[PDB]
Design a protein around this motif. Structure first.
Motif, mmCIF file in Angstrom:
data_model
loop_
_atom_site.group_PDB
_atom_site.id
_atom_site.type_symbol
_atom_site.label_atom_id
_atom_site.label_comp_id
_atom_site.label_asym_id
_atom_site.label_seq_id
_atom_site.Cartn_x
_atom_site.Cartn_y
_atom_site.Cartn_z
ATOM 1 N N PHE A 13 -35.460 42.654 -23.350
ATOM 2 C CA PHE A 13 -35.836 41.264 -23.238
ATOM 3 C C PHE A 13 -35.090 40.442 -24.274
ATOM 4 C CE2 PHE A 13 -38.896 39.172 -20.547
ATOM 5 C CZ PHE A 13 -38.910 37.886 -21.047
ATOM 6 N N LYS A 14 -35.196 40.856 -25.535
ATOM 7 C CA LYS A 14 -34.514 40.168 -26.622
ATOM 8 C C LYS A 14 -33.028 40.045 -26.294
ATOM 9 C CE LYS A 14 -32.294 40.732 -29.795
ATOM 10 N NZ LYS A 14 -32.757 41.513 -30.975
ATOM 11 N N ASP A 15 -32.467 41.125 -25.758
ATOM 12 C CA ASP A 15 -31.061 41.152 -25.379
ATOM 13 C C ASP A 15 -30.786 40.095 -24.319
ATOM 14 O OD1 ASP A 15 -28.363 42.884 -25.285
ATOM 15 O OD2 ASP A 15 -28.949 42.385 -23.226
ATOM 16 N N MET A 16 -31.591 40.111 -23.257
ATOM 17 C CA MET A 16 -31.448 39.144 -22.173
ATOM 18 C C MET A 16 -31.414 37.727 -22.726
ATOM 19 S SD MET A 16 -34.041 38.344 -19.009
ATOM 20 C CE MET A 16 -35.403 38.227 -20.167
ATOM 21 N N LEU A 17 -32.237 37.479 -23.740
ATOM 22 C CA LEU A 17 -32.295 36.174 -24.375
ATOM 23 C C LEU A 17 -30.934 35.816 -24.956
ATOM 24 C CD1 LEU A 17 -35.179 36.452 -23.753
ATOM 25 C CD2 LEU A 17 -35.760 36.099 -26.147
ATOM 26 N N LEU A 18 -30.271 36.819 -25.529
ATOM 27 C CA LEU A 18 -28.951 36.630 -26.116
ATOM 28 C C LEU A 18 -27.864 36.723 -25.046
ATOM 29 C CD1 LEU A 18 -27.179 35.977 -28.294
ATOM 30 C CD2 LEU A 18 -27.619 38.164 -29.391
ATOM 31 N N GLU A 19 -28.271 37.055 -23.823
ATOM 32 C CA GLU A 19 -27.332 37.181 -22.710
ATOM 33 C C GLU A 19 -27.052 35.828 -22.065
ATOM 34 O OE1 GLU A 19 -25.715 40.530 -21.492
ATOM 35 O OE2 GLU A 19 -26.023 39.991 -23.601
ATOM 36 N N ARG A 20 -28.110 35.129 -21.661
ATOM 37 C CA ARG A 20 -27.956 33.826 -21.026
ATOM 38 C C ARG A 20 -28.155 32.712 -22.039
ATOM 39 N NH1 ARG A 20 -30.164 36.383 -16.437
ATOM 40 N NH2 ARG A 20 -29.348 38.513 -16.685
ATOM 41 N N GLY A 21 -28.626 33.085 -23.221
ATOM 42 C CA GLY A 21 -28.860 32.112 -24.263
ATOM 43 C C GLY A 21 -30.105 31.295 -24.013
ATOM 44 N N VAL A 22 -31.241 31.835 -24.436
ATOM 45 C CA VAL A 22 -32.514 31.160 -24.293
ATOM 46 C C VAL A 22 -32.628 30.119 -25.395
ATOM 47 C CG1 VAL A 22 -35.037 31.462 -24.442
ATOM 48 C CG2 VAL A 22 -33.654 33.068 -23.118
ATOM 49 N N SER A 23 -31.700 29.161 -25.336
ATOM 50 C CA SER A 23 -31.606 28.060 -26.286
ATOM 51 C C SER A 23 -32.727 28.086 -27.311
ATOM 52 C CB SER A 23 -31.615 26.744 -25.528
ATOM 53 O OG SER A 23 -31.654 25.642 -26.415
ATOM 54 N N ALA A 24 -32.370 28.438 -28.537
ATOM 55 C CA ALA A 24 -33.327 28.528 -29.627
ATOM 56 C C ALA A 24 -33.901 27.158 -29.998
ATOM 57 C CB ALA A 24 -32.663 29.188 -30.825
ATOM 58 N N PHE A 25 -33.645 26.159 -29.155
ATOM 59 C CA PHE A 25 -34.145 24.807 -29.383
ATOM 60 C C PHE A 25 -34.255 24.039 -28.065
ATOM 61 C CE2 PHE A 25 -29.863 25.457 -31.338
ATOM 62 C CZ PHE A 25 -29.127 25.238 -30.189
ATOM 63 N N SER A 26 -34.970 24.625 -27.106
ATOM 64 C CA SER A 26 -35.164 24.005 -25.795
ATOM 65 C C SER A 26 -36.524 24.387 -25.213
ATOM 66 C CB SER A 26 -34.042 24.420 -24.839
ATOM 67 O OG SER A 26 -32.826 23.776 -25.174
ATOM 68 N N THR A 27 -36.784 23.973 -23.974
ATOM 69 C CA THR A 27 -38.055 24.275 -23.328
ATOM 70 C C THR A 27 -38.012 25.620 -22.617
ATOM 71 O OG1 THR A 27 -39.493 23.668 -21.459
ATOM 72 C CG2 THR A 27 -37.264 22.734 -21.496
ATOM 73 N N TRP A 28 -39.026 26.431 -22.890
ATOM 74 C CA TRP A 28 -39.154 27.765 -22.316
ATOM 75 C C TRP A 28 -38.905 27.780 -20.804
ATOM 76 C CZ3 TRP A 28 -39.857 32.911 -23.071
ATOM 77 C CH2 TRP A 28 -40.451 33.647 -22.039
ATOM 78 N N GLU A 29 -39.111 26.645 -20.140
ATOM 79 C CA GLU A 29 -38.910 26.565 -18.696
ATOM 80 C C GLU A 29 -37.430 26.506 -18.348
ATOM 81 O OE1 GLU A 29 -38.679 23.843 -15.522
ATOM 82 O OE2 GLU A 29 -38.076 25.944 -15.288
ATOM 83 N N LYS A 30 -36.685 25.672 -19.057
ATOM 84 C CA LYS A 30 -35.255 25.597 -18.829
ATOM 85 C C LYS A 30 -34.690 26.980 -19.093
ATOM 86 C CE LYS A 30 -32.630 22.382 -20.375
ATOM 87 N NZ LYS A 30 -31.907 22.239 -19.080
ATOM 88 N N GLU A 31 -35.245 27.600 -20.122
ATOM 89 C CA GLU A 31 -34.850 28.931 -20.503
ATOM 90 C C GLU A 31 -35.301 29.920 -19.445
ATOM 91 O OE1 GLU A 31 -32.826 28.338 -23.076
ATOM 92 O OE2 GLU A 31 -33.700 26.396 -22.541
ATOM 93 N N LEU A 32 -36.317 29.534 -18.673
ATOM 94 C CA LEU A 32 -36.797 30.389 -17.607
ATOM 95 C C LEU A 32 -35.677 30.622 -16.626
ATOM 96 C CD1 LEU A 32 -39.749 30.769 -18.314
ATOM 97 C CD2 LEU A 32 -40.331 29.917 -16.042
ATOM 98 N N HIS A 33 -35.359 29.608 -15.826
ATOM 99 C CA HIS A 33 -34.312 29.762 -14.829
ATOM 100 C C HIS A 33 -33.129 30.533 -15.405
ATOM 101 C CE1 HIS A 33 -31.696 26.636 -16.459
ATOM 102 N NE2 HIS A 33 -32.735 25.789 -16.521
ATOM 103 N N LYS A 34 -32.789 30.234 -16.661
ATOM 104 C CA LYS A 34 -31.672 30.902 -17.328
ATOM 105 C C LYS A 34 -31.781 32.426 -17.227
ATOM 106 C CE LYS A 34 -28.826 29.322 -18.192
ATOM 107 N NZ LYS A 34 -27.379 29.217 -18.527
ATOM 108 N N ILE A 35 -32.974 32.953 -17.496
ATOM 109 C CA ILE A 35 -33.210 34.400 -17.460
ATOM 110 C C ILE A 35 -33.893 34.868 -16.172
ATOM 111 C CG2 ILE A 35 -33.272 34.722 -19.945
ATOM 112 C CD1 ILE A 35 -36.038 33.934 -20.034
#
Length: 71
Positions: A13-35
């Protein structure tokens, strides 16, 4: 058993976050579609997943910020 049971999952999971870039300063939802475009987004429960997010955005931001704010 020394990285192999849950840690592995929480790692994929942590990796996936660094894969698509779960913007460390954005909304978890935008980050949703990303992952979410991946089924591994449904790995950790809303508990272990909550920590992975706040913990990722916390450490990642502090670094990419002190450097040059990344963006």
């Amino acid at each position: 058993g020394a990285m192999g049971s849950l840690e592995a999952r929480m790692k994929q999971f942590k990796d996936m976050l660094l894969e698509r870039g779960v913007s460390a300063f954005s909304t978890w939802e935008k980050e949703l579609h990303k992952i979410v475009f991946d089924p591994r987004y449904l790995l950790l429960n809303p508990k272990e997943r909550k920590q992975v997010f706040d913990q990722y955005v916390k450490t990642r931001a502090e670094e990419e910020r002190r450097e040059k704010k990344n963006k």
